Structure formats: structure tokens, C-alpha cells
Amino acid sequence: DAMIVIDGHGIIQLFSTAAERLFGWSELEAIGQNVNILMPEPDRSRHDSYISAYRTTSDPHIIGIGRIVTGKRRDGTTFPMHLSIGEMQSGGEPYFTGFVRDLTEHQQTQARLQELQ
Amino acid sequence: DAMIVIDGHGIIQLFSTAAERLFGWSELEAIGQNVNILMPEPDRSRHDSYISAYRTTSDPHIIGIGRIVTGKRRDGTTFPMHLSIGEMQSGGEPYFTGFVRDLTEHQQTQARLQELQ
Amino acid sequence: DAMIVIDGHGIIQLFSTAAERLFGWSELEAIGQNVNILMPEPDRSRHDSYISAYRTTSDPHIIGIGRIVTGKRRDGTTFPMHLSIGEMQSGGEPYFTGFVRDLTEHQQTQARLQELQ
Amino acid sequence: DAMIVIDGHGIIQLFSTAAERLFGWSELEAIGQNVNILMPEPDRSRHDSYISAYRTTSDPHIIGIGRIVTGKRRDGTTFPMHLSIGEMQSGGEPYFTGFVRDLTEHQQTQARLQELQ
Amino acid sequence: DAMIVIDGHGIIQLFSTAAERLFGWSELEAIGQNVNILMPEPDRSRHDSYISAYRTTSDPHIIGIGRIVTGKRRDGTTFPMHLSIGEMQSGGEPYFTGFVRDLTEHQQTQARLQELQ
Amino acid sequence: DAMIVIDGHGIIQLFSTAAERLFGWSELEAIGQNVNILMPEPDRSRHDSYISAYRTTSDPHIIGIGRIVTGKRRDGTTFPMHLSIGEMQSGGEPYFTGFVRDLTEHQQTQARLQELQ
Ligand code: HEM
Ligand code: HEM
Ligand code: HEM
Ligand code: HEM
Ligand code: HEM
Ligand code: HEM
């Protein structure tokens, strides 16, 4: 699956090839942008508050738990995806790694089985 | 899973043992019959048009894509199944191979999990 | 997954560690109790009749078939689980083995994919 | 896979259907016999010492670890199998559960791949 | 995996796309050729005798059993593969279906793990 | 599995929790060290030449191919592992991501099956 690394403020630092395939942004396009560009509203506007809340409280909601969420492609289409977040440290500052698993195929098979009785 | 081979007009040429188990027709019973006997209406009556449309346009809908569809047993019961279609040539004429995966178990587990809250 | 063994009257004889983790009862707590404590009503009150009906008729409903059912934890929360039942004999009397697979994760992933369009 | 339950002295108390298929002994034949009948020498003669050593020291070698060992069928043929052992208590005495996974297929595929260059 | 269909004399009748990828022969190249071109000697020269022996005796060695064998590519390189054979009838004559699973990756991983201690 | 990120000179920039578990080095201990500390000789001394050779030639040996290699823990024990390498760019410089899959379990099961006939 796809891999993204962000700094303590949600800025994309590293964007894997698979992330380019999934989200539609090239590495140069994605790096330097806030990770919130990869999700729809309301999560998009709230994303910084999610990171800030974790830095303040150290209380995890997805970190070490995982969660299926809605992601957004550059073309504006949305998709279901599983998200796991790793916490790292480099040069005195926090960095977060995001592993993204596209569940579009799963969602469609399930809806199709439901739709066929 | 089950395997069927048809000629360019939808006539069953080869019918595997697993196809006999799934559809309820023996090989001798199935061979020489149109593949449309394995599906309910409206697909059943439209099936020849689907094959003819592909021979004319060469524009695929399931070939090289795959699709979950409703199949029909000889006893008249229907079931969800995944279908993949391979295109072959033998003695100057087109033949199509169909690989069928019975998704009855999957559909029932899913409906049951949904029904139990 | 979890394993439980009961006598011909539904009394728990053996309760695996994994069963302790899933149901919330320790082995000493569970042993000597009727297996009906592991399920909600109406199955709970009917459970003895299910065992008695099998001893009389020898007609199986889950034995050698399997079934997804709702189980109940000691804290009173319910969960979906797959149940397989094995039939054994020891010292002239019937014993039944129950293999339990927790499908909570499966049910939640499915509901979540459905809820996200 | 196969399931066996023994008392604190290695006597078979319960023998699943799958264990009957794998080992070649029927449930009535197996129950009341020492579990050592299911393995070749030298493990066979040493088996009681393995159980006794655990009761004395409480130091596990397979319990909670697992191990691939050589098992023996009634017809005298041997096979590789994975063994996991669960420890239980019933009516003041220890009982042990053995889950057996036949690895014959695995061993043969591996030897065959090795033998074909 | 790859699929091939032969007549009662070992002549290739149908050759799937995946078979073209695995063996190196195109469908037109393969059709009309004996299936023995897909294996090295000594199996190659003996192959007709294997089919003839089955037609005479009806005693199976791979049919309904399966077997890992050495296959051969057009470029002359050999590889390990699993073979399953289905028996069919069409227009009064026997046809055989061969499902081929390339085990090159498996063999190499295994040899590599062995070579690294 | 484990994840490591290095700069264009083999210096560890990010070291995941799973990498800490596998290699035995904490993140602070690993960061700033050359990736060659994670492998035995001769690869260890040659590692810089492997990276330099890729920067010069752009000719891949593991990048986009994968390879099972011998890794080394801090305690000095070695293990078989599968390695996949991703190539990234950040702030005008190349970075490489390494995904490490511990194959110790696989190697031991295989050796054990071989050793038991
Ligand atoms: C692309 C789609 C994504 C969506 C829709 C999403 C959404 C969310 C949500 C709902 C939360 C928790 C808020 C709460 O429940 O109170 C969260 C937290 C967080 N996310 Fe994202 N996220 C996405 C991607 C990412 C990625 C790729 C990373 C890392 C590279 C990341 C880093 C974080 C961090 C560091 C937190 C705070 C820690 C925590 O609450 O566990 N997110 N996000
Ligand atoms: C048994 C249940 C089946 C059902 C319900 C079914 C239904 C369909 C549908 C919906 C289409 C596409 C029409 C469209 O979207 O415009 C199609 C096309 C086609 N099917 Fe079937 N099919 C079945 C089995 C098979 C089998 C077993 C074969 C081959 C042996 C086969 C051969 C073809 C061919 C050659 C086409 C045209 C190519 C294409 O559109 O990709 N079908 N079928
Ligand atoms: C914990 C949740 C469980 C639930 C909700 C449950 C429910 C049921 C149901 C619905 C039936 C069949 C009644 C019918 O369809 O007519 C049944 C039968 C039976 N159950 Fe349970 N069961 C549970 C656990 C167990 C366990 C762990 C065992 C064995 C240790 C067990 C032993 C049996 C036996 C012996 C029968 C009769 C045989 C048969 O009908 O196949 N049950 N149960
Ligand atoms: C059938 C083939 C079997 C073989 C070859 C085998 C062999 C062994 C070996 C090698 C040990 C450890 C001795 C040591 O390393 O010091 C052991 C221990 C033990 N085994 Fe077996 N065993 C078999 C089946 C079983 C089964 C089915 C059970 C339970 C039903 C069982 C119960 C135990 C117990 C309770 C111990 C002592 C606890 C421990 O050392 O972890 N064994 N066995
Ligand atoms: C390409 C590599 C292949 C090799 C090395 C191979 C080798 C063999 C061997 C060793 C036997 C059994 C002889 C014996 O043990 O006495 C056999 C039998 C047979 N094979 Fe092949 N085979 C290959 C492919 C195929 C394919 C693709 C088909 C069908 C399309 C096929 C059809 C048959 C038939 C019909 C028999 C006789 C039935 C039986 O003995 O079970 N073979 N082959
Ligand atoms: C820890 C055990 C490792 C071993 C034994 C190892 C060994 C090797 C070997 C044998 C080569 C290719 C030399 C050749 O065949 O000519 C290579 C190349 C390379 N490795 Fe490592 N490696 C390890 C870990 C890593 C990690 C974790 C990374 C990245 C974070 C990495 C980055 C690279 C790069 C960038 C190349 C050059 C590109 C290429 O040849 O494809 N290595 N390594």
C-alpha cells in the first residue's frame, strides 16, 4: 500500500510512488503541501486540530489503533481507505508515517453482493 | 472454480466438472446449449447481443475486467458469482473461456453479519 | 479461536484461555455453568431444548454445518461469532466441542464500508 | 486441524474426528490410551518424563511456544506435524489440549521443489 | 495461472494468454502442436505413452491428484510448476484441460533461505 | 514489517518501531548511523559502493526487484529477511525507503521439515 510521512504540522515530507498512484499527486506536487489535501471536508479543515490535539494531550485516536476513513484524490473523487499511523522522531521533532490501504475494491464487492439480493 | 468454453455464438463447447457441480447440468446436457441458460432474465435474452456487440465493436465490458453477476442453476435458483472471461482463437474462429467463482458463501456471511446488528 | 467443551446437558467442562479472553469468564468461573450463559435471550432459554432435541432426533442444525450467531460477554455486550460444533464420546456419555471465531472486526469493517457510501 | 485432550498423566480423554482421520485410531480406541502411542521412539518412551518434568518445574518447551514434530499413525507411518499445547484445569486436576496440524503436504512440496533443481 | 486444452492425442487445442506468458509460445504457434513441446526429456518422449496408457487403463497418475513437475519454455529454460488435469468430453471424444501454476518464485525463495544458513 | 529511510549516503533518517524490534536499536541510536550497521560483512563494507554505484549508473539490483538477504541485529545475531527499496526525493536530494520482512520463522520451519526426513 501507500506511504506518506508528515512533519508535526501536517506538511508532507515524503510521498511514495504508490501514494502517487492512489492520490493522483506526484511527489513534488505533494511535498510541501498539508496532508489535509488528501481528504474531504469536514476532516480537511479539522485535520490540523487533530494533530495539534495529539501534540497537546498525547491521547491517540488512530495512532496504534487504525481506522477506515474517506480519502480524496486530486481529481476530487473520494474513496474508502484504511489508515495506520506511526510516530517517529528525527532531529528533535516529531514526524508521522501514514500507511494507506485502498479499500475501494472491497467496498464495491460488498455493495454489489448486497445489491444482488 | 468452474470453467466453461463457448464459441463465437454463445454455444457451450466445454463444461468442467466444477461447472456441473455449480450449475446443475451435466457436461452432455450443457454442451451444444447456449450459455444464456446459465443466467436469469433480462441478461438471458440479451446475452447474444452482448457477444454480437463485442464481435462488432471489440469494446469489452467484462473481458479483462471481471464482474460479479447473478447466475442461475438448472433447478432455477439464482446465485452471485464472479465472472472472468478469456478470449481465445482456434481454427480461425473466436472462443471464450469463462471462469466462475461462486460467491454464495460470501453473500450469506455478509447478510448475516448485517442482520445481527 | 476459542474452545469450549460441554457435557450432554450443556454444562461447561473445559474452557480455553482464548475463550476466557473472548467471553470474559475465567475457566473456574465458567466450568460447572450452563453454556447458555454465553448467549443472549431468546437463544439462552431455548439452548437446553436445542441440545435435548438433538439427543432425541439426532437431526443437526449447527453440528457439521456451522453458523454465525450472537454471543454474549460477561459484561453483557454481545458480538457476532462463527460457531462449529464437534461431537465426541467419553466414558459412555456425549460431549460437544465448540470452536468460536469472533467476527466483531469483520462486522465493523463491513458496516464502516457501508456507512462511507 | 486435529484435537486431543489428555489428563495430567498423558492419558487420552477426548479425541476429535479429525484426529481419528489423521492418526488412524477411532475415538474409543484412542481414549484411555497414553498419548505416547501417537509418536515414534525416542519421544514415545520419554513422553511421560516430559509431562512429569512440566508438572514439577512449570518450565514450558512446547506449551505457549509450539513445535514441529514427528507424529505416528496406527499403521506405523510417520509424518511431520505442528503441535500447540493448551493447559486447562477441570475438577482440581490439569488437562492438556493438543492442536495438531498435519504438515505432510508442506514437507513433500518443499522436497519436490528441492529435488527439481 | 495458465490453461491449456488438448485432444486425446496430446495436440494443443486451446492455449490461454497466461500460458503464452509462461511458456513463451503464442496461441497460433502452440495450437496444433503436441503438448510434449512444453516439457523436457525424458517426459517429452514418454508423454504420448502417458496419455495412451490412460486411455487404455483409465488408471490416473496426475488426473484428480495433481503433481509438481518440470516444464519447459520455448527459449529452452526449465521451471517447476504444479499441474492439475481435468478430463472432458466434446463431440464424442476426450479432451484434457491442464491448469498450470508456476512455482519458480517458490523454488527460489526456498533455495535462498537454505543457502543463507 | 520494518521500515527505514536513508539519505543518499546511507545515513539512517527514520527508523520505525518495528525496525527497533527487529534490529535491536532504538530510533535515536539508529538515526545518524550508516545503514551498513544492520548487515554483516562483506555487504557491510561494500554497502556504500552499492549506493554510490546506483547514483552513478542508475542501474538497479534490488530497487523495484526485491531480494532476500542476511540482516544483522545489534546483539550480533544474523537473520534472513526480504528487502524492498523505494526511491524518493525530498528537498532536491534522494532518499531511499527500505521495507524489511523478517523471514526467520520461514527459514526455521523449512529447515525443520527438511531435518524431519
Ligand atoms: C488521507 C485521509 C485522512 C483522513 C480522512 C484522516 C482523518 C483523521 C481523523 C478522523 C483523525 C482523528 C480525529 C479524532 O478522531 O478525534 C486523524 C488524526 C491524525 N492524523 Fe489523519 N487522516 C488522514 C490521513 C493522515 C495521514 C496520511 C497522516 C500521517 C502521515 C495523518 C496523521 C494524523 C495524525 C498525526 C493524527 C493525530 C493522532 C491521533 O489522533 O491518533 N493522517 N486523522
Ligand atoms: C452465467 C452467468 C453470466 C451472466 C449473468 C453474464 C452476463 C453478461 C453481461 C452483463 C455482459 C456485458 C453486457 C454489458 O455490460 O454491456 C456479458 C458479456 C459477455 N459474456 Fe456473459 N455472462 C455470464 C456468463 C458468461 C460465460 C460463462 C461466458 C464465456 C464462456 C460469457 C461470455 C461473454 C462474452 C464473450 C461477452 C461479450 C464481451 C464483453 O462484453 O466483455 N458469459 N455477459
Ligand atoms: C455462545 C453462543 C451460542 C449460541 C447463540 C448458540 C445457539 C444455538 C442454536 C441457534 C442452535 C440450533 C437450534 C436450531 O436451529 O434449531 C444450537 C444448537 C446446539 N448447540 Fe449452541 N450456541 C452457542 C454456543 C454453543 C457451544 C459453545 C456449544 C458446545 C460447546 C454448543 C452446543 C450446541 C449443541 C450440542 C446443539 C444441538 C446440536 C445441533 O442442533 O446441531 N452451543 N445452538
Ligand atoms: C503426537 C506427537 C507428539 C510428540 C512427538 C510430542 C513430543 C514432545 C516433546 C519433544 C516435548 C518437550 C520435551 C522437551 O523438549 O524437553 C513434549 C512435551 C509435552 N507434550 Fe508432547 N508431543 C506430541 C503430542 C502431544 C499432545 C497431542 C499433547 C496434549 C494433548 C502433548 C502434551 C505434552 C505436554 C503436556 C508436555 C510438557 C509441557 C512442555 O514441555 O511444554 N503432546 N512433547
Ligand atoms: C508441461 C509439462 C508437463 C509434464 C512434465 C507432464 C508430465 C506428465 C507425467 C509425469 C504424467 C504421468 C506419467 C506417470 O506417472 O505414469 C503425465 C500424464 C498425463 N498428462 Fe502430462 N505433463 C505436462 C503437461 C500436461 C498438460 C498441460 C496436459 C493437459 C492439457 C497433460 C495431460 C496429461 C494426460 C491426459 C496424462 C495421462 C493421465 C494421467 O496419467 O493422470 N499434461 N504427464
Ligand atoms: C539490512 C540489510 C541489507 C543488506 C544485506 C543489503 C544489501 C544490499 C545489496 C546486496 C545490494 C546490491 C548490490 C549488488 O547486487 O550489486 C544493495 C543495494 C542497495 N541498498 Fe542495501 N541492503 C540492506 C538494507 C538496506 C536498506 C534498509 C536500505 C534503504 C533504507 C538499503 C538501500 C540500498 C540502496 C539505495 C542500494 C542501491 C540500489 C540498488 O542496487 O538497487 N539497503 N543492498
For residue F43, the one-letter residue type is D
Cβ pair B6, B13 in contact under 8 A: yes
Contact A81, A69 (CB under 8 A): yes
3-state helix, strand, coil in chain B (%, to 5): 35, 35, 30
Write out the residues of chain F at the interface with chain A, using a CB-CB cutoff of 8 A.
Answer: 3, 5, 13-17, 27-28, 31, 86-91, 95, 97
Grid coordinates of B114 = 448485517
Q: What's the length of chain B?
A: 117
- Residue B63 is placed in which grid cell? 473481458
Q: What angle do CA E63, E65, E68 make, to 5 degrees?
A: 100
Q: After which residues is chain C broken (C to N over 2.5 A)?
A: none
| CA dist list (Å): A66 to A60, A81, B85 | 10, 11, 37
D62: closest CA among D31, D93, D87, D88? Answer: D87
Please give the Cα distance from D15 to E93 (Å, whole number): 49
Q: Are D83 and D62 in contact (CB under 8 A)?
A: yes
Residues of A contacting chain C (CB within 8 angstroms): 68-70, 78, 80, 103, 106-107, 110-111, 114
Pair F93, E97: CB distance under 8 Å: no
Spatial CA neighbour of A85 closest among A104, A60, A107: A60
φ and ψ of C28, to 5 deg: -65, -35
Give the distance from residue F107's alpha carbon to the nearest chain E alpha carbon, in angstroms: 6
Write out chain A in H/E/C secondary structure: CEEEEEECCCEEEEECHHHHHHHCCCHHHHCCCEHHHHCCCCHHHHHHHHHHHHHHHCCCCCCCCCEEEEEECCCCCEEEEEEEEEEEEECCEEEEEEEEEECHHHHHHHHHHHHCC
All residues at 6 or more sequence positions from F112 whose CB lies less than 8 Å from its CB, including other chains: D68, D80
Output the nine-digit C-alpha cell for C111.
458496516
DSSP secondary structure letter of residue B73: -
Resolution (A): 2.3
D26 C-alpha vs ligand 4 centroid, how far in Å? Answer: 21
User: What is the Cα gyration radius of chain C?
Assistant: 15
HSE-CB of F11 using CA atoms within 13 angstroms = 10
* CA dihedral over B111, B115, C4, C8, signed as positive or negative: negative
Q: Is C47 annotated as a binding residue?
A: yes
The subunits that touch chain D, with at least 3 C-beta pairs less than 8 Å apart, are C, E, F
DSSP state of D62: S
DSSP state of C54: H
Cα angle vertex F95, ends F93, F100, to 5°? 175
Angle (CA) C93 C99 C104, round 5°? 150
* Angle (CA) D95 D97 D100, round 5°: 155
Q: Which residues contact A6 (CB under 8 A, 6 or more apart)?
A: A12, A13, A35, A95, A96, A98
Contact residues, chain F, for E114 at CB < 8 Å: 110-111, 114
Q: Residue B6 in 3-state DSSP?
A: strand
**C-alpha cell belonging to residue F61:** 539490483
Residue D98 near residue F107 (C-beta atoms within 8 A): no
The experimental method behind these coordinates is: X-ray
**What is the number of other CB atoms lying within 10 angstroms of the CB of residue E49?**
9
Calculate helix-pair angle for C104-115, A104-115, nearest 10 degrees: 90
E50 CA to centre of ligand 5 in angstroms? 7
Q: Are C2 and C38 in contact (CB under 8 A)?
A: no
H or E element in which residue B46 lies: helix B43-57
CA dihedral F50, F55, F56, F59 (to 10 degrees): 70
Q: In the block, which residue shows the cell 511456544?
A: D65
Q: Is B11 helix (H, G, I), strand (E, B) or coil?
A: strand
In the numeric block, the cell 454480437 is attached to B52
| Helix (H) or strand (E) segment spanning residue C80 | strand C78-90
What does the DSSP 8-state code read for residue B25?
-
Distance of CA D54 to the CA centre of its chain: 16
Residue of F67, F68, F78, F104 to mutate, interface with E, max E Cβ within 10 Å:
F68
Establish whether the linkage from the previous residue to F42 is cis, with ω within 30° of 0.
yes
Q: A71 - beta bridge partners?
A: A79
Give chain B positions within 8 Å (CB) of A113.
68, 80, 103, 106-107, 110
Residue D90's DSSP bridge partners are D93
Q: If you ran DSSP here, which 8-state letter would residue D76 be given?
A: S
Cell 508515517 locates to: A97
Q: Fill in the DSSP letter of residue D38.
A: G
CA separation, residue A54 to residues A57, A99, C116 (Å): 5, 18, 25
Considering only CB atoms, which residues of chain E are within 8 Å of chain F? 109-110, 112-114, 116-117
Residue-wise DSSP of E33-94: SBGGGGS-TTHHHHHHHHHHHHHHH---SSTTT-EEEEEE-TTS-EEEEEEEEEEEEETTEE
Q: Which residue puts its alpha carbon closest to atom 36 of ligand 6?
A: F51
- Considering only CB atoms, which chain B residues are within 8 Å of C114? 114
Give yes or no for a contact between D6 and D13, defined as CB atoms under 8 angstroms apart.
Answer: yes
CA distance A47 to D8: 58
Q: B33 in helix, strand or coil?
A: coil
Residues of chain E with C-beta less than 8 angstroms from the C-beta of D109:
68
Angle at A114 between CA A113 and CA A116, to 5 degrees: 65
Q: What is the third-level CATH fold of A1-117?
A: Beta-Lactamase (3.30.450)
Backbone angles phi, psi at A10, to 5 degrees: 80, 10
**What gap in Å lies between CA B12 and CA A36, rounded to an integer?**
54
Tell me the CA–centroid distance for residue C11 and ligand 3, in Å: 13
- Write the residue with the smallest CA distance to atom 13 of ligand 2: B50
Closest CA to D110 of A99, E109, E7, C25: E109
Report the C-alpha gap between F93 and D24 in whole angstroms. 65
In whole angstroms, how far apart are CA F37 and each of A1, C105, F63? 28, 40, 20
Spatial contact of E12 and E32, defined as CB atoms under 8 Å apart:
yes
Ligand 5 geometric centre to CA of D78 (Å): 29
Q: Check pocket membership of A38 for ligand 1, CB cut-off 6 A.
A: yes
Whole-angstrom Cα distance, residue D12 to residue F84? 48
How many CB atoms are closer than 10 A to CB F33?
15
Tell me the C-alpha distance between D77 and D40, whole Å: 9
**Ligand 6 pocket residue status of F90, Cβ below 6 Å:** no
Question: Cα(B70)–Cα(B42) distance, rounded to whole angstroms?
Answer: 11
Residue with cell 528487502: F83
For cell 480423554, what's the residue?
Answer: D13
Query: What nine digits make up the cell of D19?
Result: 484426529
**DSSP line for chain F:** -EEEEEETTSBEEEE-HHHHHHHS--HHHHTTSBGGGGS-TTHHHHHHHHHHHHHHH---SSTTT-EEEEEE-TTS-EEEEEEEEEEEEETTEEEEEEEEEE-HHHHHHHHHHHHT-
Q: Which residues share a beta bridge with E68?
A: E82
Beta strands in chain B (DSSP E): 2-7, 12-15, 67-72, 78-90, 93-102
Grid coordinates in use for F6?
Answer: 536513508
Contact C64, C49 (CB under 8 A): no
Q: How far is CA B63 from CA B51, B58, B83, B84, E25, in A?
A: 11, 10, 9, 7, 22
> Which region, left, alpha or beta, applies to residue A106 given φ > 0 means left and ψ of -120 to 50 means alpha?
alpha
Delimit the domains of chain B by residue range: 1-117
Closest CA to ligand 3's atom 34: C51
